[PDB]
Design a protein around this nucleic acid. Structure first.
Ligand SMILES: [Mg+2]
Ligand SMILES: [Mg+2]
Ligand SMILES: [Mg+2]
Ligand SMILES: [Mg+2]
Ligand SMILES: [Mg+2]
Ligand SMILES: [Mg+2]
Ligand SMILES: [Mg+2]
Ligand SMILES: [Mg+2]
Ligand SMILES: [Mg+2]
Ligand SMILES: [Mg+2]
Ligand SMILES: [Mg+2]
Ligand SMILES: [Mg+2]
Ligand SMILES: [Mg+2]
Ligand SMILES: [Mg+2]
Ligand SMILES: [Mg+2]
Ligand SMILES: [Mg+2]
Ligand SMILES: [Mg+2]
Ligand SMILES: [Mg+2]
Ligand SMILES: [Mg+2]
Ligand SMILES: [Mg+2]
Ligand SMILES: [Mg+2]
Ligand SMILES: [Mg+2]
Ligand SMILES: [Mg+2]
Ligand SMILES: [Mg+2]
Ligand SMILES: [Mg+2]
Ligand SMILES: [Mg+2]
Ligand SMILES: [Mg+2]
Ligand SMILES: [Mg+2]
Ligand SMILES: [Mg+2]
Ligand SMILES: [Mg+2]
Ligand SMILES: [Mg+2]
Ligand SMILES: [Mg+2]
Ligand SMILES: [Mg+2]
Ligand SMILES: [Mg+2]
Ligand SMILES: [Mg+2]
Ligand SMILES: [Mg+2]
Ligand SMILES: [Mg+2]
Ligand SMILES: [Mg+2]
Ligand SMILES: [Mg+2]
Lengths: 124, 210, 124, 53, 53, 147
RNA sequence: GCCGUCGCUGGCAGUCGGCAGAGCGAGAAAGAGAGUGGCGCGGACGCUACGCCGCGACGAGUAGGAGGGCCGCUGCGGUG
RNA sequence: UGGAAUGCGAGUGCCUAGUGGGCCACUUUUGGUAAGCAGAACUGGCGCUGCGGGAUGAACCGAACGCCGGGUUAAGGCGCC
RNA sequence: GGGCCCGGGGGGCCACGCGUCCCCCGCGAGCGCACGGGGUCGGCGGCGAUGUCGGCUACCCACCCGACCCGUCUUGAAACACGGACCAAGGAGUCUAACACGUGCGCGAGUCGGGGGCUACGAAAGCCGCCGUGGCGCAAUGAAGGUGAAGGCCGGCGGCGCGCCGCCGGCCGAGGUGGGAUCCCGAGGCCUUCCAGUCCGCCGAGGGCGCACCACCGGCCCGUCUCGCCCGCCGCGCCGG
RNA sequence: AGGGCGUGAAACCGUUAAGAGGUAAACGGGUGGGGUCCGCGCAGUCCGCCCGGAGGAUUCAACCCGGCGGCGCGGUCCGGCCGUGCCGGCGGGGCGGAUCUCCCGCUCCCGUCGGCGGGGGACCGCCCCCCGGCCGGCGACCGGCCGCCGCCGGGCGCAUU
RNA sequence: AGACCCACUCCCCGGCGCCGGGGGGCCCAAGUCCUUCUGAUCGAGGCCCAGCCCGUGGACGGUGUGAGGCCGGUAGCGGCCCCCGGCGCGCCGGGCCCGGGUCUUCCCGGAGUCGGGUUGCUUGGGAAUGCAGCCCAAAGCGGGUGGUAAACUCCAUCUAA
């Protein structure tokens, strides 16, 4: 995601600033050179970025490089990525509420009988 | 009463469970008891392997695990007969023997024969009478350089054959795998009824003759 | 670094003393004895101390040399000034200003080297 | 941080969330000092309101 | 930081011997008192013995 | 830590955080999941829909290892081999194609989700998906089966 | 007048000192910028930044909630 | 020319206690001879709320509360208490 | 009355320069006074060592106003509602399992040795990776058998009758619209005698790439339905796609 | 501490002292009266500068010697040390690799001939250690001479300091 | 079991007798050193340049507060002495007269039990998981199991009473 957000036209030779961590993404094969500044960079993303030839700054190094933050690209990972945000919204068992319920296990006989079958009772 | 949103959780605490509570405060006091009796045993059997008799190489059942290899219970009497070791004398040189094992394949029977050869060759035997050597007995030069082997004897390690990079032929690129799976699955789900429908095609079209 | 080990010493030191809504500090070379980043006598690279001379009269001045920093034995230099009340308060002043040595501590050093002279006169 | 632990199985010293921890030298550095507005260090306490009448 | 000095082994007579050892990299790892405390106040709950009426 | 809990600020208030009008009685709704069909129906229908009834066929002696089949997607297929196997086929010129054995890594089925890098492969696997096999032909490569 | 809460997501690392020049309250987006040609050795306080300082507005409360306690009780690891 | 006026920073997300006996008043209002009765509507109160007045007072009139000095009021008052 | 009370011939002006072109006919120094960014006096006087000075609080007493006994259930309690003679000590949201959310920490598509093993405090701590079995996460969907997550343009061939269908070999490649912190370009400009004149900075009309997120529309996987036309071959089929 | 005897609270009681007393007592706000002790009250703060007034030192500045410390764009002085630096090499070495390939176990077919159980060897990456090059740091990590400055000690100063 | 072959003398117990863990008993360092507090010190200060002495002993308890050095103890692959047992080697009197491989001929199994019906209990075991009562009551290329009752036919798997 930092690749495709730094490949957008125009923002070349800029430093990708993050406030969280820069995890690896094993399902990407080519890595360009990137100037990056984050709080953490996992020990398998330091490898890829440095073998590519990019720099990995810190927030103090960034504050010395560009105090006013000129030449940067603020980013932030997906916030609704957490599995928590799938139970939020309209409660389940409600017309057009694709919200995930809290169930011990998922299977044939765990909340599949009445409020889901048009046969047994109804469905929403 | 249930709250707004949560699980329907069933706690299995409707029996007098406080009576039958098992606490593990003696877990460190039994790890030392086991380790102590494990070195009293590794001192009672002085040069014999500390882990005990050698165990065979054994595939596992249950397609979940039928690609790993394991250490069985004993060497089947077939593998002992092939290796030439009497089933009642094997147990006295630290070879494990269980009679219950069969041997349907051969690639494993020869693996366990090669295993017995690799053990009956590393075996340092001490003479029954100390002050007098015997015929089938390692010479006195070994016995002084005979130590107690720690850990399992001839440990079993899952290996994988390294296959080098080939070049793909036009018979390999021609192979539609998914169609072959859906076809073999159909030709197996339908084999019985096809054979019966053809027994009927052959039981009717004969009546026309007589 | 100074700000780093100050963020470790600011509350869980052994010289820190907290009672009666006040918070002083008992560091060796802390002058004004109060718990602060500026006056702490152990955190910085260059500190100043003004102790009383071991005998009756005089004031010792304890500068912390730059070269020896992880060598506590050969780190501090000490100079006993057993002079009148004014020359010693022009020698501490020169020691700090003309050397440009931690210059925000000068009036604190004079104010302490005067408390010592005052606490060494014959009582009444 | 470049040579792993030999006696442990796979362990490298934890990385640093900031390298130059001396924010005194950082703050009075020409890189940052130039990119600042002049300090507004004047105290403007409440002006008593007299009566224009 | 990155500069690892050269500590000097001290003979048993107090005087410094000739031997030197380069400061191991562990002595530059981050000082995290919160992690140290959280680990201490949990690891020393382990040497505790049960007690109950 | 009791000294951090909420019963240390609740000393001196009569009802201890639980109500003056409606007391904190023992079980004013029944125990457990009681009244799933009678007086807790709005909750068992607003939050656990489908909790009551039967559906489907039973299977008496189910053994969870006859149906063992862990899958791996094409996107992370190239992560099973080392890195000097994917780049050695880049620098390669004799067209040789590395053999990726999947059941050796611990997956049986190969599903095709991600993109692939343009180089040939020989994927040995137990089960293949239609698209997982088409994305491999379309890049040039063979889908070996292994029983 | 004083205490407190809230807001200003306010101000202060500029204690930049004979390697000196002491400013950012003023109605009007932006430099007390560079270069290129026509004696007396002196100067309060501060800054536990989880700190300090300035401005306004506000201040009832059962059931209930939250925070802050350098309020208190008994033992444990450190430290005085 | 941000297409009436006036005012004011808004939007959104989780987790959530207590409650699910109410009562009074102006006005409208149903049953009843009526009731400090039973029952509705709107707003404001009491409950959860002191203070000045109504001698007294859950609910009326004024007015809502950090601790204090000066000044002025509300509603009520000014023979004496 | 308004127009600087348009124009001609005794009192008040926050008006008082010379040199033109022209329509209307950038630094003067001092010196004080003060209705001026919240109080000072560079004004005083009395008493003070065995009977007097100060001490708001705290002990007793006096007087004026106020003032019903607390906990409780209650629409409502000082109640002719209940508990309470007095004092001391003890006395009530605890621990375990599960779940959910929030939060701090380590690692991060991985993660965790909890079980096992190896080496006074120590029953601790350390270590194992060919001890990661296994749990949870990385894939869902169907009752199941089971299936299981972008495509487009290009030629060349066969078919229908210029498009499409299938068929081989190319290159392009993981949607879009609206809002969107942040960042980027910059017409013009930021004074000191006067113009050109470069570097450094900063502001800025307008124009851009657009984080997260939100709305909407497309796309993809499984189940199901409807309408269909084609392709596959060891088994040509109540087959498979 | 006097045989249920460490400390010996509260309610309750006795006696002594002080005050008080017809709207039960107690209570909040406000003062006044009296007591109890405290301030160890009762001639009332000190501090810097300067001016004068009387005295006493073995005393100031400035020089000389020795030590110590700071700073040094000593534009760029000598020699070190490190770099979560960067390139080179008729270099040595260790870890890892799902990158490749002479001897050996044992195997099928007559010591010939093919499969595989095992260490070399080649290779790639990292790391470590010697080689040269620069780069840049020594402010988490310096040593000598040189310069300026400060300070201390010892002299020299005879006193309008 | 017969024949062909090869291989081949410790194995066990009982003592007699001597050879290197457990219990019990006893003991093993060093200040009561000077001044000074107290009712009493185990307190306070001192003990040079052997930094008072010991320390593999600074756990603890007692002793007129508070003790490494007063006492018992603590540490020690420290010692000394008793008893038990093990592990050992000889010797006696006994045992035991012994094995494997290839052919050939032979032999081989557990009943009122399994099993079916039915009833009662139990189990997650659902057209009966297990157990038990009553009735019926076996077979021997048979029997049981193969988690849906039944027939047919295949295979897998053990060998109940
Ligand atoms: Mg509730
Ligand atoms: Mg409350
Ligand atoms: Mg209650
Ligand atoms: Mg509550
Ligand atoms: Mg309730
Ligand atoms: Mg409850
Ligand atoms: Mg009902
Ligand atoms: Mg309030
Ligand atoms: Mg109720
Ligand atoms: Mg009513
Ligand atoms: Mg109520
Ligand atoms: Mg209210
Ligand atoms: Mg009210
Ligand atoms: Mg009245
Ligand atoms: Mg008033
Ligand atoms: Mg009146
Ligand atoms: Mg009254
Ligand atoms: Mg009650
Ligand atoms: Mg009532
Ligand atoms: Mg009454
Ligand atoms: Mg009652
Ligand atoms: Mg009573
Ligand atoms: Mg109590
Ligand atoms: Mg909840
Ligand atoms: Mg969490
Ligand atoms: Mg006593
Ligand atoms: Mg006693
Ligand atoms: Mg007593
Ligand atoms: Mg009396
Ligand atoms: Mg004692
Ligand atoms: Mg002593
Ligand atoms: Mg003792
Ligand atoms: Mg002693
Ligand atoms: Mg002794
Ligand atoms: Mg002893
Ligand atoms: Mg001992
Ligand atoms: Mg029963
Ligand atoms: Mg039951
Ligand atoms: Mg069958």
């Amino acid at each position: 995601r930092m690749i495709r957000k730094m490949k957008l036209p125009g923002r070349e030779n800029k430093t990708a600033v993050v406030v969280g961590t820069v995890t690896d993404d094993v399902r990407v094969q080519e890595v360009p050179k990137l100037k990056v500044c984050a709080l953490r960079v996992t020990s398998r993303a330091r490898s890829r970025i440095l073998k590519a030839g990019g720099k990995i700054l810190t927030f103090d190094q960034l504050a010395l490089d560009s105090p006013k933050g000129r030449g940067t690209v603020l980013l932030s990972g997906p916030r609704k990525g957490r599995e928590v945000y799938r139970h939020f919204g309209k409660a389940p068992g409600t017309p057009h509420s694709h919200t995930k319920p809290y169930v011990r296990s998922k299977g044939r006989k765990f909340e599949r009988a009445r409020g889901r079958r048009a046969s047994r009772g109804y469905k929403n | 009463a249930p709250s707004r949103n949560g699980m329907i959780l069933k706690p299995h605490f409707h029996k007098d469970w406080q009576r039958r509570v098992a606490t593990w405060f003696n877990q460190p006091a039994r790890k030392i008891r086991r380790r102590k009796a494990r070195q009293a045993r590794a001192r009672r059997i002085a040069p014999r392997p500390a882990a005990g008799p050698i165990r065979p190489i054994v595939r596992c059942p249950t397609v979940r695990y039928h690609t790993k290899v394991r250490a069985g219970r004993g060497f089947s009497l077939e593998e002992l007969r092939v290796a030439g070791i009497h089933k009642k004398v094997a147990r006295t040189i630290g070879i494990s023997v269980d009679p219950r094992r069969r041997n349907k394949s051969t690639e494993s029977l020869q693996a366990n024969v090669q295993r017995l050869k690799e053990y009956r060759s590393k075996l340092v035997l001490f003479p029954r009478k100390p002050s007098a050597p015997k015929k089938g007995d390692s010479s006195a030069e070994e016995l002084k350089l005979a130590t107690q082997l720690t850990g399992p004897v001839m440990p079993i390690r899952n290996v994988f054959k390294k296959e080098k990079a080939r070049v793909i032929t036009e018979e390999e690129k021609n192979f539609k795998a998914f169609a072959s799976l859906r076809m073999a699955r159909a030709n197996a789900r339908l084999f019985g009824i096809r054979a019966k429908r053809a027994k009927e095609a052959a039981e009717q079209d004969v009546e026309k003759k007589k | 670094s100074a700000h780093l080990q100050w963020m470790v010493v600011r509350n869980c030191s052994s010289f820190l003393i907290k009672r009666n809504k006040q918070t002083y500090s008992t560091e060796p070379n802390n002058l004004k004895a109060r718990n602060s980043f500026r006056y702490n006598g152990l955190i910085h690279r260059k500190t100043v101390g003004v102790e009383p001379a071991a005998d009756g009269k005089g004031v010792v001045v304890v500068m912390k040399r730059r070269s020896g920093q992880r060598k506590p034995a050969t780190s501090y230099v000490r100079t006993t000034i057993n002079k009148n009340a004014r020359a010693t308060l022009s020698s501490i002043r020169h020691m700090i200003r003309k050397n440009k040595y931690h210059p925000d501590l000068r009036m604190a050093a004079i104010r302490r080297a005067s408390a010592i002279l005052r606490s060494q006169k014959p009582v009444m | 941080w470049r040579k792993a632990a030999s006696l442990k199985s796979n362990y490298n010293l934890p990385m640093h969330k900031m390298l130059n921890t001396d924010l005194s030298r950082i703050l009075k550095s020409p890189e940052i000092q130039r990119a600042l507005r002049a300090p507004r260090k004047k105290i403007h306490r409440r002006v008593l309101k007299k009566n224009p009448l | 930081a990155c500069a690892r000095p050269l500590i000097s082994v001290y003979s048993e007579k107090g005087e410094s011997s000739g031997k030197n050892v380069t400061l191991p990299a562990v002595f530059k790892a981050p000082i995290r008192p919160d992690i140290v405390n959280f680990v201490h106040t949990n690891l020393r709950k382990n040497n505790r013995q049960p007690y109950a009426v | 830590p009791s000294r951090l809990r909420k019963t240390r600020k609740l000393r001196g208030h009569v009802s201890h955080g639980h109500g003056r009008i409606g007391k904190h009685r023992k079980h004013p709704g029944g125990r457990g999941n009681a009244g799933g069909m009678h007086h807790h129906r709005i909750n068992f229908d607003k939050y656990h829909p489908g909790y009551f009834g039967k559906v489907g066929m039973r299977h008496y002696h189910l053994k969870r290892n006859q149906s063992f089949c862990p899958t791996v997607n094409l996107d992370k297929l190239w992560t099973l081999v080392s890195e000097q196997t994917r780049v050695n086929a880049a620098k390669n010129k004799t067209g040789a194609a590395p053999i990726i054995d999947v059941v050796r890594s611990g997956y049986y089925k190969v599903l095709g989700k991600g993109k692939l890098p343009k180089q040939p492969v020989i994927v040995k696997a137990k089960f293949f998906s239609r698209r997982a096999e088409e994305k491999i032909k379309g890049v040039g490569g063979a889908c070996v089966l292994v029983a």
